[PDB]
């Protein structure tokens, strides 16, 4: 289990835990519970890169204590 932080450009800093093998789709589902933005209106960014549910977090390289960006779309 790892702990990653998500900061929205609009103004929403929420933290959420997951796994490096966990996919972005499951990641948005767990985060959607805290932000209440639904898995269809959440957009994650990793160093100027859009994360998609079809790709796993391990592909984007998401580990414990990592920084992630949040977007509403």
Swiss-Prot record:
GO biological process: cell morphogenesis involved in conjugation with cellular fusion; mRNA splicing, via spliceosome; positive regulation of RNA splicing; post-translational protein modification; protein modification process
Coiled-coil region: none
Short name of one Pfam family: ubiquitin
Superkingdom, taxonomy of origin: Eukaryota
Keyword list, A-Z: Ubl conjugation pathway
Domain Ubiquitin-like: from-to ranges: 1-73
CC terms in the record's Gene Ontology section: cytoplasm; nucleus
GO molecular function ontology, one term from the record: protein tag activity
KW Chloroplast (keyword) present: no
Biological role stated in the UniProt entry: Forms conjugate with SPH1 and HBT1. Involved in morphogenesis.
Protein name: Ubiquitin-like modifier HUB1
Species for this entry: Saccharomyces cerevisiae (strain ATCC 204508 / S288c)
């Amino acid at each position: 289990m790892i702990e990653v932080v998500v900061n929205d450009r609009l103004g929403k800093k929420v933290r959420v835990k997951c796994l490096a093998e966990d996919s972005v789709g499951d990641f948005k589902k767990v985060l959607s519970l805290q932000i209440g933005t639904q898995p269809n209106k959440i957009v994650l960014q990793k160093g100027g890169s859009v994360l998609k549910d079809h790709i796993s977090l391990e592909d984007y390289e998401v580990h414990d204590q990592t920084n992630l960006e949040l977007y509403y779309l």
